[PDB]
Design a protein around this nucleic acid. Structure first.
Ligand SMILES: *[C@@H]1O[C@H](CO)[C@@H](O)[C@H](O)[C@H]1O
Ligand SMILES: [K+]
Ligand SMILES: [K+]
Ligand SMILES: [K+]
Ligand SMILES: [K+]
Ligand SMILES: [K+]
Ligand SMILES: [K+]
Ligand SMILES: [K+]
Ligand SMILES: [K+]
Ligand SMILES: [Mg+2]
Ligand SMILES: [Mg+2]
Ligand SMILES: [Mg+2]
Ligand SMILES: [Mg+2]
Ligand SMILES: [Mg+2]
Ligand SMILES: [Mg+2]
Ligand SMILES: [Mg+2]
Ligand SMILES: [Mg+2]
Ligand SMILES: [Mg+2]
Ligand SMILES: [Mg+2]
Ligand SMILES: [Mg+2]
Ligand SMILES: [Mg+2]
Ligand SMILES: [Mg+2]
Ligand SMILES: [Mg+2]
Ligand SMILES: [Mg+2]
Ligand SMILES: [Mg+2]
Ligand SMILES: [Mg+2]
Ligand SMILES: [Mg+2]
Ligand SMILES: [Mg+2]
Ligand SMILES: [Mg+2]
Ligand SMILES: [Mg+2]
Ligand SMILES: [Mg+2]
Ligand SMILES: [Mg+2]
Ligand SMILES: [Mg+2]
Ligand SMILES: [Mg+2]
Ligand SMILES: [Zn+2]
Lengths: 213, 92, 82, 50, 104
RNA sequence: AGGCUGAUAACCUA
RNA sequence: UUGACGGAAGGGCACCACCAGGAGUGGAGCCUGCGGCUUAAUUUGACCAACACGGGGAAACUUACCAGGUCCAGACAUAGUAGACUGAGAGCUCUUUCUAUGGGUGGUGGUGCAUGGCCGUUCUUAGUUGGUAUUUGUCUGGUUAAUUCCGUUAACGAACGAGACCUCAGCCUGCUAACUAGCUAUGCGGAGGUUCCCUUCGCGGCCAGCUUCUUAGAGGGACUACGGCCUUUUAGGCCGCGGAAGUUUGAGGCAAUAACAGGUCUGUGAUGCCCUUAGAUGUUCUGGGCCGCACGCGCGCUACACUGAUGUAUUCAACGAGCUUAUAGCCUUGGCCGACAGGCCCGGGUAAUCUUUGAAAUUUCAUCGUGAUGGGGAUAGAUCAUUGCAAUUGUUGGUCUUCAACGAGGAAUUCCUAGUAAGCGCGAGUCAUCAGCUCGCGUUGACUACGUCCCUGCCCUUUGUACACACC
């Protein structure tokens, strides 16, 4: 038995470490996040990935390996933890998925200008209020510089950034050094709460149209 | 790395019995938490498998994560001399 | 200082444009009207809009204002000139 | 080999994320160095309010 | 026959914690059980203050990190089986439910 | 020797 | 043409500017960081925006440095065939029962002027940008903390920053409701005073009641609303009632464009190239060093006393933190032993439950009496205990003794506008032991101003320019 303070910290450290382990094991499977749903008699781990068919493996072989190694590593009782793969509903509104998408294009050899506009164009087609892609490093010359690709709406300051901005940072290990990818997607107000935050922007005021009855 | 033949079997037995293994990057640790073999001998032996593609390696937060591959299962069966119908726990 | 920004001034004029009949010269009644006829995210923003609109209602009483288009008031002026 | 006692002091403790021995945060049992904690703070559940 | 059962709820999310507390009190008022609570313990504010810079150069700026823990205590006067029925409902994520027989 | 100056000269102090 | 600059002009602005002041710092002793010197080594980064900074309070470890001894923790692939010494029997013999080649791996090795990320800074100011050489938009004027607004108008309509926003604090005798928070009443009991009665204290009641005090959810509350006056019909400003609150109520968090060869390769299983890789720059072990002392500098601590020191009596916080239970590893009550330091025993607490019944300055009475004095407590001797595997180059904590400079600090210079400055202590980080540091917390509680552009800078406009590496 440990105190509440340490138990909550220990739960946060488990989530942070699990995400890192999956971020590297499932790097090339579109890994976009994880949700840890601890319940009586069972803790459920839901893995979000754009390409779920590669996370499950042939006849679920890989998802069973991940479950087994996770249970042993984190001192779980056998058959008391489950891993479930899941697909990202709107791949173009997830910055972590777009940052990894841009990463593999650059590794493959696609030009930076062309690759960054492909992501920028795809995100705006998916129904985003705006987007911004930044690539930094040794692009062609020995000296480093930054290229910024921006489109649409964006905010930087205040509380709304936490709810409306979806940002990710990734490193690309190229032959001449490391490029830095930053994808920053501004979401749109979704009252249903699925595509974006349900709470509106603080400065957005809406006047109801009067009725003639 | 001169692993005793008795310790070598335990690693292969455990690795074949369960298609995954893990270790903390701590060479001083006396015993592996899942095998009597010393922690270092587990890390070095599965480094040999990694170079022969018998396992797939992941590292994060000071821990190794190894996963058996199809070739690794083929090799371990001959080494352990077990019936061809037996498979690791992850394949069932 | 206490200068109202475009958010407060713009919203206040729109409210008075299409709810001039409902609005009154009382701040406390006007801020209950804004809850009914508008979606203002924060209470502090709602108070500033209600206070400035109440200021604009007093302006309209004495005469015409620049950025507010009151159709019924406009029709009265047209009849006067014609 | 590794005979020297390692029951207390900086040499006994290391960062759980990176393994570095410096600037370890031991409060609440975090056992992370100050640089790794700032990177992982949001995921752990810590937040900046003021 | 009737015993004072103590239910303790902990969470970082206030809205989820308050939602589960209402679901339990309202779920027990349907069975006409006597309910004491929810009692809100003082909020625990874990605090880590750390240097922003990964090196020691520049103005010494600090980040104050806070992790708030909210705790609720509900006492239900009923049998363990009935309480097990009320608490068995699905609980919101991040809310930790803990049922114990009050030592009185 | 200190101070003044980003620094030197000049200047000021001991 | 755009910028930058000007000992050019105009407008505006900032306690990292000044003014009016407060506390000081600079002088003394000491603590700690930097340079220099010394050294086997005294590892190293950094020079407004380095110098109690690298969370860098190093006994070992840390550790990068120095003197030495080990170990392989050299995957994979190819081809070949009891003694002597010693710091220590560590290794090497005795006794008992791998070698090339490529290719890797490790490295607190080098390059932050090859990089990612993060952070600092320009820059706390209000600034920046599309669509339809460069410019207009983005403005003469008024106004604002604000490129904030009102208006002007060859622009119109938008995007960022600002504001909004989020957190904490301030009001609620209203809502929700509490045996881990209390109050009031009542019952019983103790003590005092006059059997009732009165004062006071203790205990009890999940069927005394209740939520003022405490806790924390949901809401409410301020909008400059109202009055007077001043401003252009404006935007707005000054004063005032009421009000918990009338500076965007207070304080923070977040925070644009474009930049810097700013810092970090010594946070990282971030990383290119280079170096090294078994007489190793890998790793570990022993010992020393990082602290070494003619000297210069920076952040500080303690002081020079009577508005005090000492000895009594007395008395009021807030933020927070806490264990593997092994005899017991964390915070520790109570009892006993001891002058102290500390020790033994029974326990509580994984915590609004136990530590926590929880400070100091101050208040109060006495002593001291202007004397470097009972101010000051450096330096030093003797001795005791605690942490640790280990205390010497004193880890720290006690006891007696020793009793230095310092009598308010030159040129110069920092911070600060209200629960603030200053004083006063407390928790947390580091942590086996060690706080003169840092990050927070409360307690006591002011002087002065409500301005200005004189100094140091900043923003906008006009203007000059032979500057653009941009007046260094
Ligand atoms: C990737 O997509 C998930 C979808 O749930 C979203 O939650 C993350 O914010 C995004 O990065
Ligand atoms: K002084
Ligand atoms: K400093
Ligand atoms: K950099
Ligand atoms: K009595
Ligand atoms: K770095
Ligand atoms: K490097
Ligand atoms: K570190
Ligand atoms: K002394
Ligand atoms: Mg904004
Ligand atoms: Mg803001
Ligand atoms: Mg001023
Ligand atoms: Mg100054
Ligand atoms: Mg002055
Ligand atoms: Mg002083
Ligand atoms: Mg001096
Ligand atoms: Mg001095
Ligand atoms: Mg500055
Ligand atoms: Mg050392
Ligand atoms: Mg050593
Ligand atoms: Mg080394
Ligand atoms: Mg390294
Ligand atoms: Mg640089
Ligand atoms: Mg109350
Ligand atoms: Mg409220
Ligand atoms: Mg800026
Ligand atoms: Mg440089
Ligand atoms: Mg040092
Ligand atoms: Mg300092
Ligand atoms: Mg004295
Ligand atoms: Mg008290
Ligand atoms: Mg004396
Ligand atoms: Mg020390
Ligand atoms: Mg320090
Ligand atoms: Zn770390």
């Amino acid at each position: 038995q440990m105190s509440k303070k340490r138990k909550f910290v220990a739960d946060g450290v488990f989530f942070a470490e699990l995400n890192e382990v999956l971020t590297r094991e499932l790097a090339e499977d579109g890994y976009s996040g994880v949700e840890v749903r601890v319940t009586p008699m069972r803790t459920e781990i839901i893995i979000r990935a754009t390409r779920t068919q590669n996370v499950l493996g042939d006849k679920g072989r890989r998802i069973r390996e991940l479950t087994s190694v996770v249970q042993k590593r984190f001192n779980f009782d056998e058959n008391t933890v489950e891993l479930y793969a899941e697909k990202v509903n709107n791949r173009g509104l997830c910055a972590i998925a777009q940052a990894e998408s841009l990463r593999y294009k650059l590794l493959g050899g696609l030009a930076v200008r062309r690759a960054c506009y492909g992501v920028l164009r795809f995100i705006m087609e998916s129904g985003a209020k705006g987007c911004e892609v930044i690539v930094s490093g040794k692009l062609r010359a020995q000296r480093a510089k930054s290229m910024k690709f921006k489109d649409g709406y964006m905010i930087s300051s205040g509380q709304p950034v936490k709810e409306y901005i979806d940002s990710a940072v990734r490193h690309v290990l190229l032959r001449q050094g490391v490029l830095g990818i930053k994808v920053k997607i501004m979401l749109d107000w979704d009252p249903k709460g699925k595509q974006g935050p349900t709470t509106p922007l603080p400065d957005l005021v809406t006047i109801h149209p009067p009725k003639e009855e | 790395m001169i692993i005793p033949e008795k310790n070598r079997r335990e690693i292969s037995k455990y690795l074949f019995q369960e298609g995954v293994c893990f270790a903390k990057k701590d060479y001083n640790l006396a015993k592996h938490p899942n095998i009597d073999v010393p922690n270092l001998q587990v890390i070095k032996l599965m480094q040999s498998f990694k170079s022969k593609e018998y396992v797939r390696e992941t590292f994060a937060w000071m821990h190794y994560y190894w996963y058996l591959t199809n070739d690794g299962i083929e090799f371990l069966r001959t080494y352990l001399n077990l019936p061809s119908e037996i498979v690791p726990a992850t394949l069932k | 200082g206490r200068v109202r920004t475009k958010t407060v001034k713009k919203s206040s004029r729109q409210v008075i444009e299409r709810y001039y009949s409902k609005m009154t010269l009382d701040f406390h009644t006007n801020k209950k009207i804004l809850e009914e006829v508008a979606i203002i995210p924060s209470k502090r923003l709602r108070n500033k809009i209600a206070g400035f609109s109440t200021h604009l209602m007093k302006r309209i009483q004495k005469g015409p204002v620049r950025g507010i288009s009151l159709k019924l008031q406009e029709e009265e002026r047209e009849r006067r000139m014609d | 080999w590794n005979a020297h006692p390692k029951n207390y002091g900086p040499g006994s403790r290391t960062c759980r994320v990176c393994g570095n021995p410096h600037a370890i945060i031991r409060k609440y049992g975090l056992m992370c160095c100050r640089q790794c904690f700032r990177s992982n703070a949001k995921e752990i559940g810590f937040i900046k309010y003021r | 026959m009737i015993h004072k059962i103590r239910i303790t709820l902990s969470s970082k999310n206030v809205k989820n914690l308050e939602k589960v507390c209402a679901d339990l009190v309202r779920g027990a008022k349907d069975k006409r059980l006597r309910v004491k609570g929810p009692v809100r313990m003082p909020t625990k504010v874990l605090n880590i203050t750390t240097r922003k810079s990964p090196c020691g150069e520049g103005t010494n700026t600090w980040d104050r990190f806070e992790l708030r823990v909210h705790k609720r205590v509900i006492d239900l006067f009923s049998s363990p089986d009935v309480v097990k029925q009320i608490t068995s409902i699905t609980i919101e994520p991040g809310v930790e439910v803990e049922v114990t027989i009050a030592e009185s």
